[PDB]
Amino acid sequence: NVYQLKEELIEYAKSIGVDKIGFTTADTFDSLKDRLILQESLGYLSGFEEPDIEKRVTPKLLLPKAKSIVAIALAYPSRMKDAPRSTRTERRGIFCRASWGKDYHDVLREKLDLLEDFLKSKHEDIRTKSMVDTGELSDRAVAERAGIGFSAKNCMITTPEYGSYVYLAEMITNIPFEPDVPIEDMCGSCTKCLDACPTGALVNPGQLNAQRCISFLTQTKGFLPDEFRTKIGNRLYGCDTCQTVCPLNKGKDFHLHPEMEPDPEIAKPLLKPLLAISNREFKEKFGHVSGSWRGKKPIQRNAILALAHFKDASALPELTELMHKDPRPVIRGTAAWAIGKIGDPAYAEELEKALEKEKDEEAKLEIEKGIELLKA
RNA sequence: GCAGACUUAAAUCUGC
Ligand code: B12
Numbered sequence A: 001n002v003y004q005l006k007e008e009l010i011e012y013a014k015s016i017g018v019d020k021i022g023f024t025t026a027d028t029f030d031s032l033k034d035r036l037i038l039q040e041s042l043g044y045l046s047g048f049e050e051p052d053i054e055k056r057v058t059p060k061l062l063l064p065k066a067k068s069i070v071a072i073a074l075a076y077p078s079r080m081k082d083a084p085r086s087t088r089t090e091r092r093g094i095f096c097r098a099s100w101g102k103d104y105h106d107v108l109r110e111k112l113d114l115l116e117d118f119l120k121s122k123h124e125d126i127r128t129k130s131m132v133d134t135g136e137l138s139d140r141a142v143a144e145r146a147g148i149g150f151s152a153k154n155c156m157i158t159t160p161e162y163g164s165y166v167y168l169a170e171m172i173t174n175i176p177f178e179p180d181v182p183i184e185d186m187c188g189s190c191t192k193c194l195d196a197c198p199t200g201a202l203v204n205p206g207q208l209n210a211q212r213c214i215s216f217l218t219q220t221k222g223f224l225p226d227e228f229r230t231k232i233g234n235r236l237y238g239c240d241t242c243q244t245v246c247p248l249n250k251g252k253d254f255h256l257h258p259e260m261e262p263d264p265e266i267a268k269p270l271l272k273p274l275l276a277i278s279n280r281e282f283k284e285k286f287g288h289v290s291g292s293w294r295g296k297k298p299i300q301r302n303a304i305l306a307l308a309h310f311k312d313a314s315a316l317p318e319l320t321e322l323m324h325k326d327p328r329p330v331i332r333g334t335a336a337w338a339i340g341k342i343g344d345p346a347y348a349e350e351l352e353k354a355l356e357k358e359k360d361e362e363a364k365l366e367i368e369k370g371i372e373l374l375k376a
Numbered sequence B: 001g002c003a004g005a006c007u008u009a010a011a012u013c014u015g016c
């Protein structure tokens, strides 16, 4: 009965494109609670997580009388077919692989909906509660306890066949399914991810200072701290460094889901056009990727910083207009700072003009930084 | 229609 239901669920999940499925109980996540209290007090959290620790570690609070959790994982592509070349006149930014093609929030919500349907179509009264990323549970904690993959040193859940390049989701049920056993650590004495992290956000194996992680920094809506502006490169959203150096990901390039295939012109887009983009054109072109959940502003800020990184002089006119006309303090100030960074002294007069008119205190400071740079 | 804010992609509010 319960065993047959479990095998039928696994059979259906694979047919609708789930790459890996696993089972765990609805027991509380005790070690996780202690861990979350630790990270919180160390200031190592991001603020993006659920504030209520009880709801995060107690499945039976989320779904009354729950008895199990079904965890699913989908592998996403890692290599890009015919990536467009970034030249001196035409510089390009880059999205992380978790932001290629169709938003996994929607892809995996679909798989969870079909699996909720499947169970509810058989026995009653099977009750469920699904979630992907935006739920209370820790998708990694569930995936680990369900045997999807092991906790690697880069904090990533890593699977034997697909590596770390997988999306995670889970469904809480009232079915007392038989749980699986967690898989073993494959990292060994390797430390490549820890050593290659540009900001040392990986303070220890399996421990992240989220405030120092590039991925987090690309999604903040305010001014990017001076400390990290030199380490973003041309990233527009997220970071893949602790994964692309990982030996467990060598050869892992799976094209199993067509809608996840990146559009090279929007995954690796031209920087300058992003600066003058309209809301409709952004919604049409970027509105269906995961990296647009905070809006266009963090992406544009990063695009500016990316141009400063490249010292693209051809971006100076658009940056200048942005400094003068844009109603967003973060955009004005960053444009001012980038202008000074690119290093053309001819634009110094324009910085002073902007300075004399700025009313936003923080934007003022960024202009002053930009002026100081151009003197040098 | 355009733009901004906000929580988060269409909802709410504001400006043209
Ligand atoms: C907040 C958040 C972030 C934050 C911080 C992530 C972090 N490491 O804490 C930021 C914005 C930086 C981020 C970045 C990324 N994230 Co993110 N993020 C989340 C989110 C919403 C919650 C994660 C969280 O609460 N972390 C807090 C820590 C404490 O817990 P946890 O890592 O989830 O759980 C593990 C630890 O607690 C550990 N642990 C427990 N006890 C102990 C004890 C010891 C001693 C140690 C060492 C560890 C340890 O074991 C748990 C299970 O592995 C989840 C979705 C979700 N709802 O769960 C996605 C999620 C974790 N992110 C994901 C992705 C894809 C990424 C990025 C790769 C995106 C990118 N390309 O930039 C990067 C990777 C950066 C990295 N190396 O961690 C995937 C991870 C998939 C996978 N294969 O593991 C998730 C699961 C989203 C999803 N639904 O697929 N993200």
Ligand code: SF4
Binding pocket: A154, A196, A197, A198, A199, A200, A201, A202, A208, A212, A213, A214, A215, A238, A239, A240, A241, A242, A243
């Ligand atoms: S995503 Fe980038 S910044 Fe964050 S821990 Fe990994 S390598 Fe470091």
Ligand code: SF4
Binding pocket: A152, A153, A154, A186, A187, A188, A190, A191, A192, A193, A194, A242, A245, A246, A247, A248
């Ligand atoms: S780089 Fe090495 S230590 Fe880091 S996750 Fe990959 S195998 Fe593990």
